[PDB]
């Protein structure tokens, strides 16, 4: 049996819903260690330890741009930290270092008897997410820390599009009409550079650069996919293989690519 499987068998409609099966609570990190600020989202009733995910915004941006993922993922059985960077103008390398410091602090709080997440985290199972420069930072985190179990980035941007060393399962949401980090010159080159991993590319029809951010009109599809990808790869949960690897019939999806995503 899979010791990391949590929750009932999913369906497309239940993964499209706004909340998964677990109750979510949250707290503000009191003394952030190596990053600006953090909010920790966690399930109260997951039925065992769960993996941890750290999410980073883009240039100038704060937690609110990316924090819908917090309850979306936590309610399916994850501990999620959404961070503010030390400076809103930090670049992708710094964002990556901060993202890894936030994972480090989730692991420390897992061992802190006073923390709400004491004993809730499997600190051997971690993932990285982020928007734009925070997505570039996440890809650098994955390249530099190949024990990470999954990455899921949105409208990623970085100074280099060559992420060929990444062996971490990587999902990319791209936004069709993005003029900040365009699909043709940024998101698809990043995707195409990776030959050593499970990977996926989903282009959202008509989406602006913020098409995967909090308040987007496609939280059903985007949230299904992000949760399925993290469940499949962070939990090794093959009940999620169908949803993680599926080529969606969604009017929100304008392009789909995947490789090494076994059904």
Out of 58, 130, 182, 226, which residue is the one contacting Cl ion (CB under 5 A)? 58
List 75, 96, 132, 138, catalytic entry:
132
Instruction: Kindly tell me which of 77 and 134 has the beta carbon lying closer to Cl ion.
Output: 134
Q: Are 81 and 39 in contact (CB under 8 A)?
A: yes
Q: Are 67 and 214 in contact (CB under 8 A)?
A: yes
For residue 167, give every residue at least 6 positions away whose Cβ sits within 8 Å of its Cβ, in sequence order, or none. Answer: 142, 146, 196, 197
The secondary structure of residue 155, as a DSSP letter, is S
- Minimum gap (Å) between residue 96 Cβ and Cl ion: 6
Euclidean distance between CA atoms 78 and 204, whole angstroms: 25
Query: E strands, the chain, where?
Result: 24-28, 37-43, 50-56, 79-84, 121-131, 150-154, 170-175, 199-204, 253-259
Euclidean distance between CA atoms 225 and 231, whole angstroms: 10
Does 262 participate in catalysis according to the annotation? no
Residue 192, strand partner residues: none
- Please report, as residue ranges, which positions from 218 to 247 form the binding site for Cl ion (by CB under 5 A): none
- Minimum gap (Å) between residue 241 Cβ and Cl ion: 31
Does 220 participate in catalysis according to the annotation? no
Q: Using CB under 5 A as the criterion, what x/- string covers residues 158-197 for binding Cl ion?
A: --------------------xx------------------
Stretch that binds Cl ion, among 52-60, 164-172, 218-226, 243-251 (CB under 5 A): 52-60
Under the binding rule (CB under 5 A), the answer on residue 143 touching Cl ion is no
Instruction: Kindly tell me which of 157 and 163 has the beta carbon lying closer to Cl ion.
Output: 157
Under the binding rule (CB under 5 A), the answer on residue 209 touching Cl ion is yes
Q: Would you state the structure tokens that stand for residue 120, as one six-digit string? A: 């809730």
Does 214 participate in catalysis according to the annotation? no
Instruction: Kindly tell me which of 60 and 247 has the beta carbon lying closer to Cl ion.
Output: 60
Instruction: Kindly tell me which of 14 and 177 has the beta carbon lying closer to Cl ion.
Output: 177
Euclidean distance between CA atoms 118 and 131, whole angstroms: 28
Annotation: binding site for poly(ethylene terephthalate): 59, 133, 157
The secondary structure of residue 244, as a DSSP letter, is H
Under the binding rule (CB under 5 A), the answer on residue 93 touching Cl ion is yes
Where in the sequence numbering do the catalytic residues fall? 132, 178, 209
> Which residue ranges make up the site for Cl ion (CB under 5 A)?
58-59, 93, 132-133, 140, 157, 178-179, 208-209
């Amino acid at each position: 049996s899979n010791p990391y499987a949590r929750g009932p068998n999913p369906t497309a409609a239940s993964l499209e819903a706004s909340a998964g099966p677990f109750t979510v609570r949250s707290f503000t990190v009191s003394r952030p260690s190596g990053y600006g600020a953090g909010t920790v989202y966690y399930p109260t009733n997951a039925g065992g330890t769960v993996g941890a995910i750290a999410i980073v915004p883009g240039y100038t941006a704060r937690q609110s741009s990316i924090n819908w993922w917090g309850p979306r993922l936590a309610s399916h059985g994850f501990v999620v930290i959404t961070i503010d960077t030390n400076s809103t103008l930090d670049q992708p390398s710094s964002r990556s270092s901060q993202q890894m410091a936030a994972l480090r602090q989730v692991a420390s709080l897992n061992g802190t008897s006073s923390s709400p997440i004491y004993g809730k985290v499997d600190t051997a199972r971690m993932g990285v997410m982020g928007w734009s420069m925070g997505g570039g930072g996440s890809l650098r985190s994955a390249a530099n820390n190949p024990s990470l179990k999954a990455a899921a980035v949105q409208a990623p941007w970085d100074s280099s599009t060559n992420f060929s060393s990444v062996t971490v399962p990587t999902l990319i949401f791209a936004c069709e009409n993005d003029s900040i980090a365009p699909v043709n010159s940024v998101a698809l080159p990043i995707y195409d550079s990776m030959s050593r991993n499970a990977k996926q590319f989903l282009e959202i029809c008509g989406g602006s650069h913020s098409c995967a951010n909090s308040g987007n009109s496609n939280q059903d599809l985007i949230g299904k996919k992000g949760v399925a990808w993290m469940k499949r790869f962070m939990d090794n949960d093959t009940r999620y293989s169908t949803f993680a690897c599926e080529n969606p019939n969604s009017t929100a999806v304008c392009d789909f690519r995947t490789a090494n995503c076994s059904l």
